[PDB]
Amino acid sequence: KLTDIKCSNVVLLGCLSSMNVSANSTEWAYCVDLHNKINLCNDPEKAQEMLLALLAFFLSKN
């Protein structure tokens, strides 16, 4: 479970990285913080909700 979501985050950043999202520092920092903190996350549902936040953010930029 954790691994399932934990790995799933990496692909999301890669998708974003292709979109030069780093052009604006704020969004890139937000995404990086969320990813890094979910990776260290040990209890699933919290990781799940941060992953949902990531996905919601990505869907905004398509």
């Binding site: 052009a23 604006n24 520092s25 704020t26």
Partner: protein
């Protein structure tokens, strides 16, 4: 290869000489003991342009008081302000408290006024 590398080194060295600001250095260099000044302070005393990277609005407040900055025993006027993204940011926005919504590490391009 040998010719190309040494030629490129010559070109870079000549570029440095071009951007050296030769006169300003000597005017202050030869006052010190035997004309020897630490390299760590030569630009701050001889350079014409000054860049500063703030951490937040509070650093902005401390560093400047009326759009000018005091550093290395000299007064520096703020010409242009860039944010993280490099976009122009005018003094009106930073002065206002609303800068909270703005990217924090502002960088200011300051110039020497004597």
């Amino acid at each position: 290869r040998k010719s190309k590398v040494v030629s490129a080194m010559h070109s870079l060295l000549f570029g440095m000489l071009r951007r050296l600001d030769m006169s300003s250095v000597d005017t202050i260099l030869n006052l010190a003991k035997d004309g020897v000044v630490p390299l760590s302070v030569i630009p701050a005393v001889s350079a014409t342009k000054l860049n500063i990277v703030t951490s937040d609005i509070d650093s902005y407040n401390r560093i400047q008081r009326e759009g000018c900055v005091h550093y290395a025993g000299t007064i520096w006027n703020i010409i242009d302000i860039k944010d993280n993204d490099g976009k122009v940011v005018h003094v009106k926005e930073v002065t206002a408290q609303n800068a909270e919504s703005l990217s924090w590490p502002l960088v200011l391009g300051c110039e020497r006024i004597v």
